[PDB]
Amino acid sequence: SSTMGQVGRQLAIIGDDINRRY
Amino acid sequence: SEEQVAQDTEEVFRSYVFYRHQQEQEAADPEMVTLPSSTMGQVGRQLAIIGDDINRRYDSEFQTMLQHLQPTAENAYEYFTKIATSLFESGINWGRVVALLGFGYRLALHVYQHGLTGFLGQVTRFVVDFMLHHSIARWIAQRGGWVAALN
Ligand SMILES: [Cu+2]
């Protein structure tokens, strides 16, 4: 993403996806 | 046994890195082919399976990520710390733990691809210390340790 905080929040979103699928 | 979980994290992450790299070859970083049937090894392998699925589904995000990782790796700690802290500012769950593991794996792989060797141990230390100081180890301990990931 544009900034590292943006990157971290995108990873939070991906982690929630993982938590919902596995 | 928060400290126990924190120590277990090292072996979990090492096994995760090994198996994720191995299945990514079934389609390179020598440092990821060495130094591993214990409980934590098995947990790492399972998590590496789910992490490979996620890495294929979110390839572009994980590649875009590395634009902030300087090619010399002089800011490895800064990059890791800031991104993971943003990751866990909104809470902790197992999925986010797996995401942190995959983030560490890609950071370790990329610093090698940029010609910095012998850095995988340090990314492992990054992961262990972050999970300890950001209450991730306490959380995992509160859910029964790393072994509870096998469910
Ligand atoms: Cu690069």
Numbering used by the authors:
A (entry chain B): 68 to 89
B (entry chain A): 23 to 49, 56 to 64, 68 to 182
What does the paper say about this structure?
Mitochondrial poration by pore-forming BCL-2 Effectors, BAK and BAX, initiates apoptosis. Its apo structure exhibits a stable globular conformation incapable of executing poration. Autoactivation is mechanistically similar to direct activation: binding of exposed BH3 of BAK or activators to the activation groove induces conformational changes in the electrostatic network at the bottom of this groove destabilizing helix α1 to initiate BAK unfolding.
Here we show that autoactivation involves binding in trans of the BH3 helix α2 of active BAK to the activation groove of dormant BAK. We determined the crystal structure of this complex to 3.1 Å resolution, which revealed 10 unique complexes in the asymmetric unit. Cu2+ acts as crystal contact coordinating two BAK monomers. The GGC linker is largely invisible in all 10 complexes suggesting its intrinsic disorder and minimal contribution to the structure of the complex beyond tethering. The BAK BH3 peptide forms a helix bound to the activation groove of BAK, similar to previous BH3-bound complexes of BAK. However, in marked contrast to those previous BAK complexes, autoactivated BAK exhibits rearrangements of a buried electrostatic network with helix α1 at the bottom of the activation groove. In apo BAK helix α1 electrostatic network is stabilized by 2 hydrogen bonds between α1 R42 and α3 D90 and 2 hydrogen bonds between α1 E46 and α5 R137. The destabilized conformation of the electrostatic network is unique to autoactivated BAK providing the structural basis of BAK triggering by BAK BH3.
